[PDB]
Amino acid sequence: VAAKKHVPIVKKRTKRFMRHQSDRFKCLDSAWRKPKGIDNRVRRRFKGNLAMPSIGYGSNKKTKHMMPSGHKAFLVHNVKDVELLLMHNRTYAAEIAHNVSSRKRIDIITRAKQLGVKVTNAKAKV
Amino acid sequence: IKQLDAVYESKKGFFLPANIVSQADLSRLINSTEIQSVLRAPKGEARTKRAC
Amino acid sequence: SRPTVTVFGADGKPTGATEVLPKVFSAPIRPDIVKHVHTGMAKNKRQPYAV
Amino acid sequence: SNVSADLIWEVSRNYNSFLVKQRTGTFSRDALNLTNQHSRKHAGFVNDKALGIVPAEKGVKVIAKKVKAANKPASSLYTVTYKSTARKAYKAIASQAAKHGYRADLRQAAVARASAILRSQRPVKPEPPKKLRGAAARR
Amino acid sequence: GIDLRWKHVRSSHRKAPKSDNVYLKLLVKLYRFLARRTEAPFNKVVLRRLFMSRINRPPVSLSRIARNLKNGNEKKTVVVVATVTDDNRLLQVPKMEVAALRFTAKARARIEAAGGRTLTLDQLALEKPTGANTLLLRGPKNAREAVKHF
Amino acid sequence: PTRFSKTRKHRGHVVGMRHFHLLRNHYWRPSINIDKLWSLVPSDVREQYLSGQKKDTAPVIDLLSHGYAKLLGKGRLPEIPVVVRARYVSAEAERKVKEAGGVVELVA
RNA sequence: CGGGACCGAGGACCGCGCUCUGCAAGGAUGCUGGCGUAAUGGUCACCAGCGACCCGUCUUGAAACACGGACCAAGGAGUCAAGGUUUUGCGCGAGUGUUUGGGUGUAAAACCCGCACGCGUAAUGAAAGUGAACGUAGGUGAGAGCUUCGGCGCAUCAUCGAC
RNA sequence: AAAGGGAAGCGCUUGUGACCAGACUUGCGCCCGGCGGAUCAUCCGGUGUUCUCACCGGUGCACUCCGCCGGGCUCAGGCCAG
Numbered sequence: 045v046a047a048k049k050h051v052p053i054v055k056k057r058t059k060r061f062m063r064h065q066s067d068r069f070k071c072l073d074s075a076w077r078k079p080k081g082i083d084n085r086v087r088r089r090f091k092g093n094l095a096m097p098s099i100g101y102g103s104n105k106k107t108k109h110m111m112p113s114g115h116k117a118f119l120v121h122n123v124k125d126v127e128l129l130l131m132h133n134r135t136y137a138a139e140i141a142h143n144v145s146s147r148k149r150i151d152i153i154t155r156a157k158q159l160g161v162k163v164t165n166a167k168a169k170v
Numbered sequence: 171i172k173q174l175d176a177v178y179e180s181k182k183g184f185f186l187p188a189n190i191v192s193q194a195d196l197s198r199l200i201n202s203t204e205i206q207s208v209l210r211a212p213k214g215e216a217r218t219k220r221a222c
Numbered sequence: 223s224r225p226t227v228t229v230f231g232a233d234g235k236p237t238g239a240t241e242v243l244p245k246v247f248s249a250p251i252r253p254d255i256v257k258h259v260h261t262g263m264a265k266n267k268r269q270p271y272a273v
Numbered sequence: 274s275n276v277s278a279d280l281i282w283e284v285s286r287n288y289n290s291f292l293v294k295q296r297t298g299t300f301s302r303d304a305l306n307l308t309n310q311h312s313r314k315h316a317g318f319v320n321d322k323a324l325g326i327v328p329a330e331k332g333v334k335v336i337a338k339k340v341k342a343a344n345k346p347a348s349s350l351y352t353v354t355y356k357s358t359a360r361k362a363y364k365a366i367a368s369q370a371a372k373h374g375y376r377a378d379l380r381q382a383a384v385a386r387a388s389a390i391l392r393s394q395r396p397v398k399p400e401p402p403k404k405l406r407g408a409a410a411r412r
Numbered sequence: 413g414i415d416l417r418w419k420h421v422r423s424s425h426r427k428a429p430k431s432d433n434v435y436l437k438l439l440v441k442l443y444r445f446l447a448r449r450t451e452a453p454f455n456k457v458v459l460r461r462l463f464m465s466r467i468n469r470p471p472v473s474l475s476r477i478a479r480n481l482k483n484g485n486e487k488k489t490v491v492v493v494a495t496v497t498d499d500n501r502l503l504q505v506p507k508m509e510v511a512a513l514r515f516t517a518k519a520r521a522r523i524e525a526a527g528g529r530t531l532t533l534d535q536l537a538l539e540k541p542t543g544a545n546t547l548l549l550r551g552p553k554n555a556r557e558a559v560k561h562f
Numbered sequence: 563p564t565r566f567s568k569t570r571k572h573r574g575h576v577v578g579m580r581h582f583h584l585l586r587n588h589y590w591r592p593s594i595n596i597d598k599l600w601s602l603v604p605s606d607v608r609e610q611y612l613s614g615q616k617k618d619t620a621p622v623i624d625l626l627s628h629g630y631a632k633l634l635g636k637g638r639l640p641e642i643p644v645v646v647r648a649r650y651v652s653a654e655a656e657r658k659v660k661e662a663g664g665v666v667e668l669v670a
Numbered sequence: 671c672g673g674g675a676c677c678g679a680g681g682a683c684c685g686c687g688c689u690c691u692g693c694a695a696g697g698a699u700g701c702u703g704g705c706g707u708a709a710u711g712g713u714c715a716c717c718a719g720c721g722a723c724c725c726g727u728c729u730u731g732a733a734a735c736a737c738g739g740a741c742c743a744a745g746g747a748g749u750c751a752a753g754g755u756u757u758u759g760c761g762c763g764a765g766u767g768u769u770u771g772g773g774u775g776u777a778a779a780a781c782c783c784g785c786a787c788g789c790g791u792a793a794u795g796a797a798a799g800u801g802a803a804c805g806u807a808g809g810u811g812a813g814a815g816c817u818u819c820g821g822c823g824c825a826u827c828a829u830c831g832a833c
Numbered sequence: 834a835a836a837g838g839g840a841a842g843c844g845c846u847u848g849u850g851a852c853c854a855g856a857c858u859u860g861c862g863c864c865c866g867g868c869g870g871a872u873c874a875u876c877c878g879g880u881g882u883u884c885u886c887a888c889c890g891g892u893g894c895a896c897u898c899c900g901c902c903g904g905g906c907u908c909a910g911g912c913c914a915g
Contacts, residue, residue, distance in 0.1 A: 046910075065725070068842060071742065080575065081726065092722030092844055109297045112855050116297035128293065128300050130389050131308045131382075136297065157400075158393050167403075171227065174244040189250045190514050191435040192532040194277035199534055200445055205541045209449045219684070222696060248275050253284055254432040255760065267779045283434035337883075351882055357872050358899065365887055373883040401858050406708060409852070430758060454815065465758070482806060483822060497763060501597040503612055503640060516763055525609075548815045550825045558756075569748055578796025593792075636802050652801060
């Protein structure tokens with residue numbers, strides 16, 4: 045069903061924090077690593093350089109872990125898992141785990157329709 | 171069941187231990203009349219109104 | 223007096239007999255001590271390995 | 274004595290077999306747990322007096338702990354099946370939750386769970402067909 | 413920017429025990445409630461000593477308790493947030509009412525044989541919730557081999 | 563355990579005489595004070611003596627059977643006559659035993 | 671008395687008040703329109719304005735010099751043991767330590783057993799040796815807590831005594 | 834598919850093109866009319882309980898209860914705006 049009424053969801057930063065020189069070296073993954081060189085410009089925070097993650101970018105406590113519909117994702121593996129969201133259909137949505145078979149997915153989707161629970165990936169394996 | 175008492179009475183150097191708490195029911199202890207009769211009146215509620 | 227416990231027969235029905243509950247069932251329940259002793263005791267059957 | 278509901282909560286507040294812990298919240302599989310939330314208020318296996326509601330073939334089925342049979346698990350639950358009007362089910366559940374002082378704080382949660390189960394037992398409506406959108410999906 | 417020559421200081425005292433004893437957790441909850449809802453400084457001191465560690469809770473002997481029972485303290489309830497130990501150098505134990513965290517078996521037996529009473533801290537909370545007519549005792553803190561070698 | 567070490571956290575940031583052929587069995591002589599002397603009596607009989615239910619009997623204590631060789635005089639004794647058998651005794655311990663009404667017997 | 675910009679945090683009532691049928695008084699509501707889908711939003715590629723030295727190491731005060739780096743995958747560096755020390759948690763407590771060994775076993779597990787022994791319970795002296803109460807285990811000044819409201823006074827500190 | 838007048842690569846912010854995740858589809862509560870059934874209220878008996886609250890069996894004879902179907906009404910509902 046529709047989610048419970050909430051404050052507007054604000055992301056302070058949508059862009060990811062890319063690792064320094066990971067755009068120039070393929071052996072460097074783009075996952076963030078804090079530069080530890082004493083002369084590093086990103087670590088010293090010169091302007092025009094990559095930003096570094098800090099707790100000031102944190103999301104609002106009222107809307108943290110909310111998908112844009114306002115629900116919180118709950119990973120489910122079976123019908124007994126999705127029936128745990130009987131009392132939270134306006135707050136939690138169900139997300140079927142990737143290794144669940146198609147027929148069990150049909151069972152979970154049928155139970156979630158009876159319980160009025162949103163399924164995030166209900167069109168999978170059809 | 172009959173032999174369990176003899177089993178713990180035959181262990182030399184060991185006795186069944188004394189608990190540091192006599193009554194484990196904290197609700198009974200707190201809401202007993204002996205404690206409640208001497209308490210100060212509450213200075214607030216669970217939720218506080220926003221002043222300004 | 224000390225509590226009693228029912229004795230059940232081979233059919234699963236009570237036999238009419240009771241036993242006095244042993245005094246160990248009123249011991250303190252200490253999960254931290256249980257965890258410490260279990261951590262120590264679970265390593266005592268280990269076989270050594272080395273290159 | 275040496276055992277209380279407070280002590281059972283202190284023992285099993287960090288781990289038990291009913292616990293489902295994830296990033297977005299902690300849930301409980303306990304049958305006597307209304308709202309399926311891990312807390313002392315809702316831990317029915319911990320609390321001395323507790324209620325639980327499950328679906329039946331039609332209607333709800335409510336179990337309640339019996340304080341005098343805590344050491345007898347086969348006869349520790351008082352079970353009533355309500356297969357009748359939803360209003361009568363709510364009245365009876367609220368009566369056994371609040372009238373005699375048997376966890377009056379769980380009255381709203383019990384009525385809510387009964388209402389949720391009875392609404393889930395209704396027939397479902399067919400969903401509208403999906404509308405194709407964009408460039409690749411429509412063509 | 414603001415010029416702060418002085419520095420705000422985080423607390424240098426315990427707010428919770430490091431022990432995972434569930435009975436100690438229940439006792440801490442009880443005395444938190446008592447120290448919040450009563451004006452007695454006794455409950456605050458007892459809660460803060462329940463927070464403390466074992467080197468900060470030295471044992472108290474029956475000889476020390478009998479020493480402090482003199483001069484009009486014979487009827488006060490002795491409160492020790494520590495282990496009460498026995499002293500076999502003391503041949504005659506007087507009648508006394510002691511509440512403690514734990515007793516050794518010989519000390520408890522000698523108190524009960526002398527005709528006194530042994531209590532836990534929750535029983536102390538039941539009978540003297542404001543700590544009236546109580547004698548609060550501590551053991552020798554500096555009487556330790558490490559403290560001697562300091 | 564390895565996982566609790568600080569190394570895991572730091573991952574990414576790195577006179578007188580000489581005695582030839584000394585034998586300690588010559589110099590073995592453990593000592594006990596008189597304020598521990600009544601602890602060698604078994605507890606029930608000790609409590610009977612301290613209460614005063616034995617007004618016609620005096621206890622005899624052998625220190626060598628308990629593993630002590632010398633009686634020292636720290637503390638005080640009750641007014642009960644006690645016979646003490648010891649290899650060595652200090653002057654104050656013997657004085658306090660005599661004041662308590664007993665006798666110190668010398669043994670080998 | 672106008673003109674403009676940005677913002678609407680909170681979520682039954684409680685309060686301060688006022689111009690007192692009510693209110694601009696402890697935080698935005700009311701009315702209306704178009705659309706209801708890629709329209710808003712997002713990702714990717716590119717152009718545009720502005721911004722922006724190549725990393726690591728070394729050196730000293732710092733730069734510069736110098737050294738390493740053609741690219742990618744996998745491997746790759748404060749570990750273990752013994753002995754101390756401080757702190758935390760636990761058990762017992764003037765005691766404590768079953769596991770050298772013995773008994774037992776569903777058999778390298780678990781359970782049970784005790785003599786000796788180690789440490790502690792007494793120190794000092796090169797040694798021979800001797801070995802800790804004048805006193806409610808002392809006086810004074812503080813000192814949490816308690817108090818019958820006169821005082822009793824934990825830990826600890828300073829000082830004077832006693833052994 | 835795109836860019837390129839002696840480096841590219843990167844940050845902030847628009848735009849273009851390509852490709853997408855959501856959200857929405859109506860719910861709740863009333864007033865009528867038409868159906869389909871008596872697990873309406875009370876009382877009686879049994880049973881269980883938290884010992885005053887419930888379930889079961891009889892009793893309702895349709896101005897009472899429970900669903901369904903057509904309308905009408907109010908409210909709450911998505912995005913961008915005045």
